[PDB]
């Protein structure tokens, strides 16, 4: 029943920590929030519907030990894949949502994540609903190779169609948001929000070094123009609430 804070190493009683939205009382570090928690933390009680609850991955490139690596994370997490999607309400205002969860294969984006994000984006488009995405990812899933790359295109396509309908897309970048994800849908919100000390970049040092032989923080990205707001999690609900109200189709 105990989760240790990685920053300051002080041990805590999870019950109250969850009620503080996984924010460290002592040092204010923002611990990861699981998909269903995040969703609960922002939606009206009992208003969540989950889309495509049981969509599993497959193996197009026949990558070794890929399907079993997926089980390890399904069994450990409880999730079928690394993104939870569906519709909810917040202070009376409906919206579609896609929370990514970085425990399941570091939140890497393969075919399932692309298809689920598209299916919700495309739903919102029909029903004219704002859409909110919480990115948490290490980039593209290398096990599906080129297909994972094309997910950047697959997503963007639904998103731009959604934008061309005059509909709000809020990009909520959580720690960590990197690679293909940050180079795709995570960067292109009408409004871009993040969280204190969240790590946001493009290519990692291990990739950049082999590919050609605290600046990634959210506060730094806001100075350098790329975020509308750094939102403390105590103001998350209220912040999202007001944004949707301003963008409420009168």
């Amino acid at each position: 029943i105990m989760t240790k804070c990685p920053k300051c190493k002080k041990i805590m009683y999870t019950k109250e920590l969850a009620e503080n939205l996984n924010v460290c009382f002592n040092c204010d570090h923002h611990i990861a929030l699981t998909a269903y928690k995040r969703i609960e933390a922002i939606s009206d009680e009992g208003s969540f519907t989950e889309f495509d609850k049981g969509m599993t991955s497959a193996n197009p490139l026949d990558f070794p030990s890929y399907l079993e690596k997926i089980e390890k994370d399904q069994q450990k997490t409880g999730l079928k894949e690394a993104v939870v999607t569906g519709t909810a309400q917040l202070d009376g205002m409906k919206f579609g949502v896609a929370v990514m969860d970085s425990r399941f294969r570091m939140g890497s984006m393969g075919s399932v994540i692309g298809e689920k994000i598209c299916r919700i984006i495309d739903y919102c488009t029909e029903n004219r609903l704002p859409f909110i995405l919480f990115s948490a990812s290490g980039g593209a899933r290398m096990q599906e190779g080129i297909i994972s790359l094309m997910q950047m295109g697959k997503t963007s396509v639904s998103l731009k169609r959604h934008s061309d309908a005059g509909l709000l897309y809020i990009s909520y970048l959580t720690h960590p948001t990197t690679g293909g994800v940050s180079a795709s849908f995570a960067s292109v919100g009408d409004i871009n929000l993040s969280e204190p000390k969240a790590l946001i970049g493009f290519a990692g040092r291990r990739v950049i070094e082999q590919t050609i032989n605290d600046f990634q923080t959210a506060e730094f990205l806001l100075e350098h123009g790329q975020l509308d707001k750094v939102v403390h999690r105590n103001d998350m609900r209220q912040t999202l609430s007001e944004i949707l109200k301003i963008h409420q189709e009168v």
């Binding site: 290398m142 190779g145 396509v157």
Partner: protein
Amino acid sequence: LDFEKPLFEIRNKIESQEEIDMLEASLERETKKIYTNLKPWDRVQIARLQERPTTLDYIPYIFDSFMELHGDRNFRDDPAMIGGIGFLNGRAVTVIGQQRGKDTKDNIYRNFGMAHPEGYRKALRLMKQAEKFNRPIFTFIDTKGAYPGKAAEERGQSESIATNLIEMASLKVPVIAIVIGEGGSGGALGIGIANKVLMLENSTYSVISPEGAAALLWKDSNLAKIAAETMKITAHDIKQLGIIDDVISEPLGGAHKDIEQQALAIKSAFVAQLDSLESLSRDEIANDRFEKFRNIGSYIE
């Protein structure tokens, strides 16, 4: 080159009476047998050859009266990403692509064809202009990824790429993209959201370099050959998956062997693909591209 070791050992002995005729005839057939039957990793080194034809090599043979246009109306003119306007069998078109550099000093100038974020914005500007004047857009992909590091990210590399992706998605003009060097993941897709995508038979397209894949997945960088074979990055590999629309033939030995021969082939593809998209109007061609990328990927419901 690594796989030219046998060819090297053949011509080593000829340059030392009846042997010479048989060895030289034997060289003829074996040289063909090798280059006609290429392994995936053979294709990766061919694409990495410093002498591999760049964008600016191909343009004069394909387009009439090509005029480079420079800049992003923002910050800089990125050497690595060139663009302009020209003609293709009478019709005005916009052309865009990464510029790899020919010799050493020129590679330094071009940053090896790795675009900064100013490059992608310069590409975007030009395509918006094309859309405005209804010009078709041809893009040349030839990059080992977008320029990484603090400076790059500090000026919005993630955002430069993501913006291109969403703007390209809804372009009301035909877009045809082609891989001539490597296809460095997001750096490549940043000018690759096209109606039709084509590849040179010995070019690469991938989420990561095989050396990258090796250092992360195999936990040992000196295993890139296997990673490449596993990763399925060849033109044929990509063609089977339905991600690209055609593979162009390449001259024996590599495209660098005969630039004009190779450039004529790219034009016949450019022309033929563009003729597919004549039936499509300004709204319908955007939808065509939507429907390409919307339907890529495999999953289990």
